[PDB]
């Protein structure tokens, strides 16, 4: 009893926990676009249907 | 996807020309005329209706 007890009193409610943080650490995607000379910015490449005035 | 995007990037916007420059030179007409003696002059023959006062 008094072992028992004891052990109760140690564990307390320590909840088990299966899993921690997952080792995978990139959420997004890879970005395989091209970058070209021609491009307008670093994001764009043309923009297309503009209308200046 | 990665060689597609190499190919893309490195063909930009090559616009394809069919042609290039005529092989024929002469824009001109071959100049038939005969050159004479009597001419008045290497590009005239006569000054038919010239009348001097």
Redesign the interface.
Known sequence: EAHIQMKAAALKSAQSRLFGLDGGISTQEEN?????T?DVSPSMHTLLGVKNM
Chains 1, 2 share one sequence.
């Open positions: 395989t676009e091209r970058h070209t021609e």
